[PDB]
């Protein structure tokens, strides 16, 4: 079958998988935020 | 070998050489004969005599042994009662 379309957008899924509350839930996710703050990223999370 | 060490930045001596040879200040090296303690029961009386001796080294072996030791092992030593006192110098050598 034809590939290239694996992104089936859904806002509820997007915010739960990669969102702010999700990142802060574990210590590993909190360190993800710290790295992006040190680099200077304008977007810390979805 | 180590040409430049991390802690001091110097060359290092290969200690397996120091445990097998003796260096006379002129530049000669002395060694034993391989096998001089092995299976003596099967060796003739003339063969055993040759093994007991102290022997010199060739020019190429002397060159290699010099590279593998540092200068400290090449200095003048004044040992009272030295049994090698008379062999540290050369006499009547045209060369």
């Amino acid at each position: 079958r034809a590939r290239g379309n694996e992104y089936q957008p859904s806002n509820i899924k997007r915010k739960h998988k990669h969102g702010w509350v999700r990142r802060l839930s574990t210590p590993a996710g909190v360190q993800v935020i710290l790295r992006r703050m040190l680099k200077g990223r304008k977007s810390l999370s979805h | 070998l180590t040409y430049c060490s991390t802690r001091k930045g110097k060359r290092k001596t290969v200690k397996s050489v120091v445990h097998r040879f003796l260096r006379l200040h002129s530049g000669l090296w002395l060694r034993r004969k391989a096998g001089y303690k092995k299976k003596l029961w099967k060796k003739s009386t003339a063969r055993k005599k040759r093994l007991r001796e102290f022997v010199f080294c060739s020019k190429t072996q002397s060159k290699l042994l010099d590279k593998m030791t540092t200068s400290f092992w090449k200095r003048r030593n004044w040992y009272a009662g030295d049994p090698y006192q008379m062999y540290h110098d050369r006499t009547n050598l045209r060369v």
């Binding site: 992104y7 957008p9 806002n11 509820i12 997007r14 304008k42 977007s43 979805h46 | -």
Partner: protein
Amino acid sequence: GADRMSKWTSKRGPRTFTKSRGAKKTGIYTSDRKFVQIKEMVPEFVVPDLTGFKLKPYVNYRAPAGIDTPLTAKALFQETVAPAIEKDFKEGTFDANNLEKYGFEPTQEGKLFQLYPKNFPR
């Protein structure tokens, strides 16, 4: 393929996602799914009577402006409280206990307009 940079508002997302644009609440929601407005929660504008008022938006260019002197706690105390205490002290009828006589308030509780924590808006 989603946009990470634009702001998250209620126009976006599915139906069940909603949030406010910053307007203050004016009532309560009960069970039975009924909204009940509270009258005291609706702000009331206190507008003065402007009849016969001499002041207008602009001022004449010939009016002299004055040297700037921001008000300080010291200045307010001298103008209002200092004179009364000075007269009483000369008469000798002054004591620390009765500072309330001169306008001191021990605590802000009970006042309609509390100065800390502020309980009224602008």
